[PDB]
Write a protein that binds this ligand. Sequence first.
Ligand SMILES: NC(=O)c1ccc[n+]([C@@H]2O[C@H](COP(=O)([O-])OP(=O)(O)OC[C@H]3O[C@@H](n4cnc5c(N)ncnc54)[C@H](OP(=O)(O)O)[C@@H]3O)[C@@H](O)[C@H]2O)c1
Ligand SMILES: Nc1nc(=O)c2nc(CNc3ccc(C(=O)N[C@@H](CCC(=O)O)C(=O)O)cc3)cnc2[nH]1
Length: 159
Amino acid sequence: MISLIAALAVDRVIGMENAMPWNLPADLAWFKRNTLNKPVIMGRHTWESIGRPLPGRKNIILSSQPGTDDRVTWVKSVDEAIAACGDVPEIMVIGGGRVYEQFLPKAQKLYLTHIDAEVEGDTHFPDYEPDDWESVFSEFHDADAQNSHSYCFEILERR
Ligand SMILES: NC(=O)c1ccc[n+]([C@@H]2O[C@H](COP(=O)([O-])OP(=O)(O)OC[C@H]3O[C@@H](n4cnc5c(N)ncnc54)[C@H](OP(=O)(O)O)[C@@H]3O)[C@@H](O)[C@H]2O)c1
Ligand SMILES: Nc1nc(=O)c2nc(CNc3ccc(C(=O)N[C@@H](CCC(=O)O)C(=O)O)cc3)cnc2[nH]1
């Protein structure tokens, strides 16, 4: 079972040239609890964004090019990424856009944070045909002194 986890602003924006213009420590906490002790598949750009391996997660990095960090596992295809996660209850695909697009059709679950932020971005979460997905969990939060925007955690399971 493959799951995607992603934080989307409006128009499904997940990435832009520069850092996201927001501060959303609850979504980071959500990301950590939903990925904890699970293999994480990411693209090389996301790997570079994160800086270091996510602790206590098997980290699997897609690149067409040889790896450049022996702390993590490097694979050259989607199927190699999955195989590299081994035999686990849940693989988390943590992005970015190229990676999500390739994994969404394979995924049984989505963990999406919907952030009420107006951002122009070059990278977007894939369209998930909502007839293919059932929302099983939805939890809205206003912005607050720690979180710059309102946001909603959603879990969807593939029909
Ligand atoms: N011209 C464009 O508009 C364009 C197109 C694509 C990306 N970008 C830029 O990249 C940034 C973020 O991109 P993102 O979030 O899409 O990155 P991402 O998915 O985290 O990382 C993408 C990288 O992951 C690797 N990858 C993904 N799928 C793979 C596969 N099946 N096999 C082998 N390697 C695979 C490739 O690394 P290697 O690069 O090492 O092969 C690829 O370049 C954005 O700022 C965006 O503008 C721009
Ligand atoms: N809900 C959600 N929120 C996100 O911020 C998110 N980010 C990505 C990809 N980018 C990143 C960037 C940094 C870290 C990261 O370093 N997380 C730490 C928390 C500590 C910190 O921010 O320095 C972690 O251990 O999980 C993770 C993913 C993928 N899915 C997401 N999904």
